[PDB]
């Protein structure tokens, strides 16, 4: 349900070390938060999000702020 999403902004550049699972951010970039947990529902420092051009992937929680 899109109308329930949080959205976030990137506070730093992030170049993905595993670009198969992770998405890149440019400082200032907006995104939507899809999940805060890993795929199995467990706590995680890596958050799943959808980028400004519709890519899905994980990013570091400490590189963003939640609008």
């Amino acid at each position: 349900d899109p109308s329930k999403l949080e959205f976030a902004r990137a506070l730093y550049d992030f170049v993905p070390e595993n670009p198969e699972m992770e998405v890149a951010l440019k400082k200032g970039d907006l995104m939507a938060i899809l999940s805060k947990k890993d795929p199995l529902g467990r706590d995680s420092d890596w958050w799943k999000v959808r980028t400004k051009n519709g890519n899905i992937g994980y990013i570091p929680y400490n590189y963003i702020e939640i609008i």
């Binding site: 550049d13 070390e17 570091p60 400490n62 590189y63």
Partner: peptide, 5 residues
């Protein structure tokens, strides 16, 4: 610069 991963 930036934070630790």
């Amino acid at each position: 610069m930036p934070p630790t991963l």
